[PDB]
C-alpha cells in the first residue's frame, strides 16, 4: 500500500475514546473512501504491556484477513502515536439490531448464520493465543450486507455476558470466550440473556450458583440447548471447547467453508445506508 | 448450500436475453437476498461450443473460488433447462461505466487497480487451464464499492477484442486473454479501442496487418506503454505471458496481494 503518514488522512467525525487510544472517521485525501482510524498512544501501549496485540493485529491477523474479523488496510507511526486504518462498519451493532426486531428474537437460519460467523472469529483469535474476554452484542458490528464482524479487540450489557471463571479468579483463558458465546447464541435465539437480577449482586449469583433454563414459549432445537448447556457449564475444566464446539451437531445444516466464503447470506437481512 | 429448484426463485426483471439462454434478476423466496439467474435452454447443447462452455461452468467453474471471478451459488436442472443463480452485481459493467467517465478515460490509479483485479481472475482461469476468450468491458462487472469482477456465467464491442491468432486459425491458446487484456488497457488509459474502422473488414485489417499507434493527445507512462504494446505482439509465441505480465513495472505501485484481500479501493468510485 501507498507509503502514507497522518497528513493523508482528513479526520471528518469522532467515533469514541479510550484510556489511550481513539477512533475517528476519516476520507483518505484524493479519494471518496472512508475508514475508522484508530489512534494510539505509543508511550500508552508500553505501560500497558500491550506490545505482543499490537504485533498480532499488524503481523499476523493482517495476513489472515479473515471474513469477520475487522479489516486493517494500513499502519504507520508519528513521533508519538501508531495509527491503524480500519474498515468503517456504518451499519451498526448487533445489540441495536436485535433490539429492533420483533420479540428481540432472531429466527434459528439467522442466529445459527451470525452464531457461526462469530465461532469462526473467535477460533482463529484463540488459534493466535488471543482471547477476546468481552463477547458481547455490543461488540458484534454488522456490515452493510448484513454478516457479523468482531469489534477490534485491543478496544474491548458486560455484566450478563461475565463468565463464572472472571468474577470469582478474574482469569482470562479461551474458556471465557465459549461462556460468552453460550450466553450469545441464548440471546440471539430466546430474546434474553439466561441469567438476569434486580441489582448486580444477583446477577453474579445467578451467574454463578443458578440452572440454566430455557423458556417455555420459545421453540428452540434440541441441538441448541445441548450446545448452550454445554458452553454454560459453571466450572471452566468442564466447559465444551473448541474443537467439540466446532464439531456439534447444532450446526448440521451450515458449511463453515460456505460460511467463510460468504455465501450464505442472512434470509432478512435490512440494508440501510 | 441448501437444495433448490426453479420454484424457490421469484423473477423480478429481466436482465439479458440471448439466443438459448436468458439472465433475470430473482428473489429466493422467504427472504429479502436477491441474485442473478442464467437459463439455458437444453435444446442449445447441441452446439459443440455452447455444449463446452456449459460444460466448463458446471464443472469447474463452479468450483472456484476468487474475489474477481462471479460468485456462483447455486447451479441446478429442470427437465428442459439448466440454471445457474450467481451474484447480482450492482454497479453493473465497466462499458457503461467508462463511457460515463469524462473522456472515456480512467484515471491511472483507477486503471491500474482494475487492470490488476482482471489479471489476477485471468491468471488463476489459466491455472484451471480454462481460456476466458471473451475479455471485453461489457463482461467486467462491478461491484456496488467499485471492484472489477469477471462474468463466468452470463450470455455469450466483442469485434474490438479478437486476438489476430483467432482471426488466422480461428484457433485458441492462453494468449488471446493477454491480447484482450492489451486492449482492455488500452481502452481504460485512452478512451478507445487502438483498431477501429468503418466496417468490421476494416477492422480485422488492422488487427491483423496495422502497427500499433497510441493517440498524440493522451500522455501514459512508458511503463504503460511498454506493457500494452508486449500485449498487443501480434505473433502469439513472441506476446508476453502470464508471470512476465505480472512482474511487469507498470505494477509498480500495486502490490497483488493486498489487491486479492480487497484492501486497495478504487479511489473514485461513485456508488449510484
Ligand atoms: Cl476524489
Ligand atoms: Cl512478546
Ligand atoms: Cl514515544
Ligand atoms: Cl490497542
Ligand atoms: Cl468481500
Ligand atoms: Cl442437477
Ligand atoms: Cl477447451
Ligand atoms: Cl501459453
Ligand atoms: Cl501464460
Ligand atoms: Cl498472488
Request: proline letters at 5%.
Given at each position: 500500500?501507498?507509503?502514507?503518514t ?38 500508552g ?30 499502519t ?16 451498526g ?12 428474537q ?39 450486507d ?84 454445554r ?6 475444566a ?33 440494508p440501510?445506508?
Amino acid at each position: 500500500m501507498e507509503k502514507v503518514t497522518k497528513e493523508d488522512f482528513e479526520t471528518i467525525d469522532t467515533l469514541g475514546k479510550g484510556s489511550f487510544a481513539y477512533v475517528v472517521l476519516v476520507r483518505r485525501v484524493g479519494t471518496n473512501n472512508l475508514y475508522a482510524m484508530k489512534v494510539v498512544n505509543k508511550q500508552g501501549l508500553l505501560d500497558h504491556n500491550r506490545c505482543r496485540d499490537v504485533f498480532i493485529e499488524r503481523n499476523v491477523l493482517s495476513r489472515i484477513n479473515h471474513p469477520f474479523l475487522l479489516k486493517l488496510y494500513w499502519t504507520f507511526q508519528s513521533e508519538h502515536k501508531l495509527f491503524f486504518v480500519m474498515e468503517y462498519m456504518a451499519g451498526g451493532d448487533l445489540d441495536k439490531y436485535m433490539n429492533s426486531v420483533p420479540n428481540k428474537q432472531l429466527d434459528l437460519p439467522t442466529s445459527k448464520l451470525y452464531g457461526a460467523e462469530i465461532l469462526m472469529a473467535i477460533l482463529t483469535l484463540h488459534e493466535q493465543s488471543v482471547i477476546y474476554r468481552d463477547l458481547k452484542p455490543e461488540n458484534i458490528l454488522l456490515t452493510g450486507d448484513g454478516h457479523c464482524v468482531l469489534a477490534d479487540f485491543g478496544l474491548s450489557g458486560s455484566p450478563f455476558y461475565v463468565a463464572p471463571d472472571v468474577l470469582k479468579q478474574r482469569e482470562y483463558t479461551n474458556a471465557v470466550d465459549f461462556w460468552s458465546f453460550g450466553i450469545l447464541l441464548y440471546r440471539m435465539l430466546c430474546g434474553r440473556t439466561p441469567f438476569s437480577g434486580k441489582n448486580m449482586k444477583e446477577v453474579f449469583d445467578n451467574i454463578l450458583y443458578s440452572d440454566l433454563r430455557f423458556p417455555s414459549t420459545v421453540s428452540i432445537p434440541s441441538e441448541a440447548k445441548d450446545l448452550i448447556s454445554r458452553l454454560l457449564v459453571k466450572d471452566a475444566a468442564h466447559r465444551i471447547k473448541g474443537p467439540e464446539v466446532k464439531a456439534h451437531p447444532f450446526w448440521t445444516g451450515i458449511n463453515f467453508d460456505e460460511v467463510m466464503q460468504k455465501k450464505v447470506k442472512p434470509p432478512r437481512w435490512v440494508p440501510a445506508p
